[PDB]
Amino acid sequence: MEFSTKTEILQEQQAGAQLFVCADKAPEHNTAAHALFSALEEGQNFSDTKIPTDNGLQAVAVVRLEKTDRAALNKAAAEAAKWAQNQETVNVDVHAFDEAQAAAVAEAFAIAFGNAAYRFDRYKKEAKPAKFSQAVFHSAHEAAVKEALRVAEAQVYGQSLCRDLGNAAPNECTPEFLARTAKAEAEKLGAHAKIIEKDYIKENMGSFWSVAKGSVEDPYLVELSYFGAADKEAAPVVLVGKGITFDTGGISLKPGLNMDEMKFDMCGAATVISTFCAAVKLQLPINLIAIVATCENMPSGAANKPGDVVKSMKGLTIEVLNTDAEGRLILCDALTYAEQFKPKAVIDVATLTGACIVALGHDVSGVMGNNQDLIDSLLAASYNVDDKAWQLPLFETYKDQLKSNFADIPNIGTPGAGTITAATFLSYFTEGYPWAHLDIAGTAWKSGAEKGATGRPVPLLMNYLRNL
Amino acid sequence: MEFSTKTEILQEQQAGAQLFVCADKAPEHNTAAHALFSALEEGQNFSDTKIPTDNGLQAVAVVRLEKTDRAALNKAAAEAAKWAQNQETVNVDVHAFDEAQAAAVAEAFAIAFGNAAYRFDRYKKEAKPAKFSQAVFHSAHEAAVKEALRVAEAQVYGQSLCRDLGNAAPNECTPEFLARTAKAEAEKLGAHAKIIEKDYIKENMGSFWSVAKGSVEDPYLVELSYFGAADKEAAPVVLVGKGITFDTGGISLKPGLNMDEMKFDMCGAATVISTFCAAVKLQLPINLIAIVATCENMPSGAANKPGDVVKSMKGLTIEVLNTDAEGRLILCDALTYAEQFKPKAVIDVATLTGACIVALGHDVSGVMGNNQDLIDSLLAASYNVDDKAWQLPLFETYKDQLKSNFADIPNIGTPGAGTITAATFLSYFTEGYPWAHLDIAGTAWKSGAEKGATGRPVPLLMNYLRNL
Amino acid sequence: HMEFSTKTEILQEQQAGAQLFVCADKAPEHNTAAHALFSALEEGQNFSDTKIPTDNGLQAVAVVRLEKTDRAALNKAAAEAAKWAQNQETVNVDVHAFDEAQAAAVAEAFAIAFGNAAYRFDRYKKEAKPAKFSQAVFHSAHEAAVKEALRVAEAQVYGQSLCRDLGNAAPNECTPEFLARTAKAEAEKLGAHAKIIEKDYIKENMGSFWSVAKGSVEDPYLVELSYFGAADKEAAPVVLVGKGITFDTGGISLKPGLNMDEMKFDMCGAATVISTFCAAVKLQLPINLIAIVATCENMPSGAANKPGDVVKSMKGLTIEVLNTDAEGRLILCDALTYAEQFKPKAVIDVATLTGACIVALGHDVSGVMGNNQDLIDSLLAASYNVDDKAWQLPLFETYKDQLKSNFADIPNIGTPGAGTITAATFLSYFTEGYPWAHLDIAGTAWKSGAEKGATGRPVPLLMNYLRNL
Numbered sequence A, B: 001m002e003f004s005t006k007t008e009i010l011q012e013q014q015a016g017a018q019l020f021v022c023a024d025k026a027p028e029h030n031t032a033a034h035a036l037f038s039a040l041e042e043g044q045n046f047s048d049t050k051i052p053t054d055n056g057l058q059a060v061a062v063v064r065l066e067k068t069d070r071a072a073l074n075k076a077a078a079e080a081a082k083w084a085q086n087q088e089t090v091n092v093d094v095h096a097f098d099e100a101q102a103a104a105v106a107e108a109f110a111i112a113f114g115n116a117a118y119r120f121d122r123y124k125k126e127a128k129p130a131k132f133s134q135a136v137f138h139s140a141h142e143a144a145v146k147e148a149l150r151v152a153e154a155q156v157y158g159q160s161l162c163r164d165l166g167n168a169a170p171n172e173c174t175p176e177f178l179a180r181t182a183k184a185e186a187e188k189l190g191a192h193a194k195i196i197e198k199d200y201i202k203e204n205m206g207s208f209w210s211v212a213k214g215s216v217e218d219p220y221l222v223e224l225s226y227f228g229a230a231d232k233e234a235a236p237v238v239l240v241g242k243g244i245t246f247d248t249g250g251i252s253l254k255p256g257l258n259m260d261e262m263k264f265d266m267c268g269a270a271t272v273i274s275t276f277c278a279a280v281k282l283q284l285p286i287n288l289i290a291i292v293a294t295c296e297n298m299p300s301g302a303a304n305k306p307g308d309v310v311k312s313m314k315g316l317t318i319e320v321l322n323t324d325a326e327g328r329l330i331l332c333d334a335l336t337y338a339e340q341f342k343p344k345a346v347i348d349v350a351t352l353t354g355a356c357i358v359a360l361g362h363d364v365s366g367v368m369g370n371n372q373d374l375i376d377s378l379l380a381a382s383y384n385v386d387d388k389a390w391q392l393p394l395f396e397t398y399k400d401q402l403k404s405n406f407a408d409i410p411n412i413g414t415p416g417a418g419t420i421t422a423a424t425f426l427s428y429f430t431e432g433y434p435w436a437h438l439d440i441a442g443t444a445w446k447s448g449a450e451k452g453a454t455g456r457p458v459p460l461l462m463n464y465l466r467n468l
Numbered sequence C: 001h002m003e004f005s006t007k008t009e010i011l012q013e014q015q016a017g018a019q020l021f022v023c024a025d026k027a028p029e030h031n032t033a034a035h036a037l038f039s040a041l042e043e044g045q046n047f048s049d050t051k052i053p054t055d056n057g058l059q060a061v062a063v064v065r066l067e068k069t070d071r072a073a074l075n076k077a078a079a080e081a082a083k084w085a086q087n088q089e090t091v092n093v094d095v096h097a098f099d100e101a102q103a104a105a106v107a108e109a110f111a112i113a114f115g116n117a118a119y120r121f122d123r124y125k126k127e128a129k130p131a132k133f134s135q136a137v138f139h140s141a142h143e144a145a146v147k148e149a150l151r152v153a154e155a156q157v158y159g160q161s162l163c164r165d166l167g168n169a170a171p172n173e174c175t176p177e178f179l180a181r182t183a184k185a186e187a188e189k190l191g192a193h194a195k196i197i198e199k200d201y202i203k204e205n206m207g208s209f210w211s212v213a214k215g216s217v218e219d220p221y222l223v224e225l226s227y228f229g230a231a232d233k234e235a236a237p238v239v240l241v242g243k244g245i246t247f248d249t250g251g252i253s254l255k256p257g258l259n260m261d262e263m264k265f266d267m268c269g270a271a272t273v274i275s276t277f278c279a280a281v282k283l284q285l286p287i288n289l290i291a292i293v294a295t296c297e298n299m300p301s302g303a304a305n306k307p308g309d310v311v312k313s314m315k316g317l318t319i320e321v322l323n324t325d326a327e328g329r330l331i332l333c334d335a336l337t338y339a340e341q342f343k344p345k346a347v348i349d350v351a352t353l354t355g356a357c358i359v360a361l362g363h364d365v366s367g368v369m370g371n372n373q374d375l376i377d378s379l380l381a382a383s384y385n386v387d388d389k390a391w392q393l394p395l396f397e398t399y400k401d402q403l404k405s406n407f408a409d410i411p412n413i414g415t416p417g418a419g420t421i422t423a424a425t426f427l428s429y430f431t432e433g434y435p436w437a438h439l440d441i442a443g444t445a446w447k448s449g450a451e452k453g454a455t456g457r458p459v460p461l462l463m464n465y466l467r468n469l
């Protein structure tokens, strides 16, 4: 999908589909678009028609934006995008807005257009791609809109990579596949990447290793590096991603129902890799490190056993009471790995707990951390793009739920506050830098007829980076 | 348990048990208390001994307060209180602190002392009461300590009544028992009370009525009134409490395991009734209304059936998809009943959802509402007394989980965010006043060897009232 | 609430209102917008619509491409067109591209789809949101055949809407009394006759029926609807028997709480029988028809049926109630015994009987079982005529071996396996005296999820069976 700009008014004789983003006034010099706007009902904000011409049927649609908030903007853009994905060329008129609103409308509509045109036909006999190829935004504020489309192209690029990695089948998207894809994507954009292999992991990352030993797939730790700040030695932001490419639960085996959706248990890793690549594509003036720990959690004659005590990279011993709580066990070592970079901030992203869905649902990500300024930054970005998030507290009393008579800490706590307890476990490894944790177990994918990866929270994370 | 004050230093020759609350310096004029303080280990903050005297064995104890926060203070006071309940007379020395600190230390220790002396021997053959009867606080700041003990006596008064109502067996604490008890306690303190009966409820509170019809116990709505403001016509604060005196689930029946603890499903009512009485006992200069809807949720040939559509007091029709989500159904009518008082603020307290324990645990109450100033006020009181609470969001997108093809709203939503969804249902009935909701399903009681009501969040609510 | 009419001329482009052209392989000739839509249809696309700006507002124009001629393909195209038609106040349908027989078939299927699409159940809602659709006009050179097709369509839509109204209603409104009195009024509004048997006769003579009802505060009822439209008003009637459990909790054998609201659809068998009866009377079919509905509530109480109880059915067999959630059998068997006093030509009972039928055949195919293969073949034929799918399951004698009791003549449930067939086998002990078939509609009577509601099936199947008598 390609986005361009024009300064002229969208002419009625222009070829292709015509979309008029209106506020309260109907479009003046388009007969069909005027009739559409005049006929809008009480709650209707989108309407379309197909006009017979000498060059075929021409698609004309209008959008009514009464409110100005980003949430209402995203909602209008999504409804129009389901129509735009079937139009090869869409000319969008946003002349009814000042410079600031026109750029915002262009960003949201371009994002909605690109994301709706996404298809994952990789394994299908016949590909059924969308017809949408080009969108042209008509505005008198060319400079602001061009920059808006640049952000939109970067976010859609990131969300698409994230969705491709989450949607892939676990027998294709193995840990090696994930590591090899992250290295190639970063290097295609001019960033740097190194792949740490199993020898180092078994020797220095014992918690990480104990989860991976039970599968025939080798583990990998991926390090993506980008130094785009003026001071190339300034303290970097580090993104840490959970890459369990499939989670059966191990010996603590999961029920068989809906277990296919555990292929999304690397969406945290995908989020981190995609946001990193999106940042490099934007040429953001930041120093950024992406760390991904990836492996498979399988049952076998050599897998982690409940009650096993393993030595983390940091040195704390962890009693693995439940082998299905294994993302904690690869994250804590990756987070210990992160502190060698002396980071300005560490954000980890993980489909960590099903309890987060019980707490906050499928549309709001969970945020926890030890640095309130960092948490407020992430919530600020959440509000900027309407990629919703909410903070859960890391009170010290939750550490009371994590006691073991055998190891330094257990990998699960006493019942209650499941999302916070897992964050508390991780906090024992993040005391040395400002840290926040994004629990995306509910927002990283959807189910039912539209089952697939969502690409969230790439919008939040990328907006956070742009505002550093 | 009576608390008094003296101005003199605690002399070593005083009869009874001797407790020295110290900061960093050992007590000077007590040999035994000096030895205890000097021998305190790294994490030790309490130490006690029994000194042989001519009048028997004398109990001597010390407390070390390194930190000044209320959480650290409450924690030391609780440790000292387990020792104080076995001493008929405890002389507390708090001379090591200035006026502000001495009042805080006396308040927390008197609260800890009184709560530890609480017993529920009502149904037992022989009562085994605590030996604790009197505590005397030695300080040169008699005025501040006298006021602190006045606050402490009110909070212990409220928490004990709250625990007495929550601990009572459901066959004693019937809805009538709860209503008549609230009426008697309010009137004993000079407040007012009227009991609305089943005829009015069946006619005007159809949602409330549909929950109660399935039991042989009549429902009641209790209205407690206190006008302590200078202007007796100024807008009151209204407290609304869920008084399901026992919850079986109805036709949507609950599992048999641990169902006895469903006798605590009226702790919201107990919290409201007790906090109301405590405020009157404090003679707070506020206008306060307490509303309690109480009934039983039983299965019968006349019970609520899943799929029933009932007309609330507000007028909205509710589809009862699950008859175990019935606390919502008495609260919404009680919240509608509240708006005739043109309230300044409405706070409802309920053991509403088991999801809140998944979200926040057993030690943190959930707060949701439509008015951020009211929520911030409650969070402020939460911090003042270390009765922990945390806000969960009422985004408009949670209303998307509450759709029904048959009624205006369903009583449960699509899976996820169970606690927020229940508040969202409730939010449809509170749009006319500043409103907040306390989900105390995790904090109102504990299990195991110490199974019983906790009396929370009476400390939070009472502090909110003192700071009005 | 919807009206269907006919015109003989072609639908002219200047006609006011929405315009729908049901085409075969050729584009519509004298409509520019309709020609453009048809020309742009893609490989699998069979419906397309647009809004043309005119001086009197936006005009809705749509086309349908019917390549195949079978009723299944026809219903599918009509349903897709109906989602568009419900937002059009007036729809003029041109069906000139078809001969007499196909034109009648197209009109019947499209009128049925239109009426069903316009259905709403806003009874309990603050603001009613009805559909704009009111009238459809079918333009054809085959007036007699199209007129008769619309007459059948009006009867089927009338029945399904009544059936859906009864199924969608909340259990605290659609009580057994509500169902019984509603059935009486509908039959009498059409000139048929109705009698309501009350709890005295049921407790005395229908002990199996009564044991299910005693556990609720709602009284039971048995409704008898009578219509004698045959030349000989004393000729042997067709009897429709319907299970009317207005809500089923399971009783002492209590159901899980998840999705139990959908147990308000456990009277859809009764709703099918009541609606099919009324549709037949509305059509003035030349038949003698009896509708029997037994209705009550299955609730848990201190007086409810207990597992292990042995009750004496109306026939006289003793039944061991091993599981109180298998209670629909227990009201049906007494209704079936009641039916044999009419010396029927055929008895068809309709019930949402077993969840096992959904396991066997799914949510889109009803199960058929019976003791008379000609009666079963007739119901399957009607099933195929209207594409209301059904399939036969066998009533082999070896299934009776799964129904043994050391205490009563028969237990109400069998050994594990073949749950739907086992239940029909239980019922078969009470229907040996007349040609009998059984429709298990536990999967087809309603939908779930976002579109949760009653479907009105198998009213299309049953009504066609009556028309083909």
Ligand SMILES: [Cl-]
Pocket (backbone or CB within 6 Å): A324, A325, A326, A327, A328, A352, A353
């Ligand atoms: Cl985990």
Ligand SMILES: [Cl-]
Pocket (backbone or CB within 6 Å): B324, B325, B326, B327, B328, B351, B352, B353
């Ligand atoms: Cl509840």
Ligand SMILES: [Cl-]
Pocket (backbone or CB within 6 Å): C325, C326, C327, C328, C329, C353, C354
């Ligand atoms: Cl049954």
Ligand SMILES: [Mn+2]
Pocket (backbone or CB within 6 Å): A247, A249, A323, A324, A325, A326, A327
């Ligand atoms: Mn796991």
Ligand SMILES: [Mn+2]
Pocket (backbone or CB within 6 Å): B247, B249, B324, B325, B326, B327
């Ligand atoms: Mn409940």
Ligand SMILES: [Mn+2]
Pocket (backbone or CB within 6 Å): C248, C250, C324, C325, C326, C327, C328
């Ligand atoms: Mn049943």
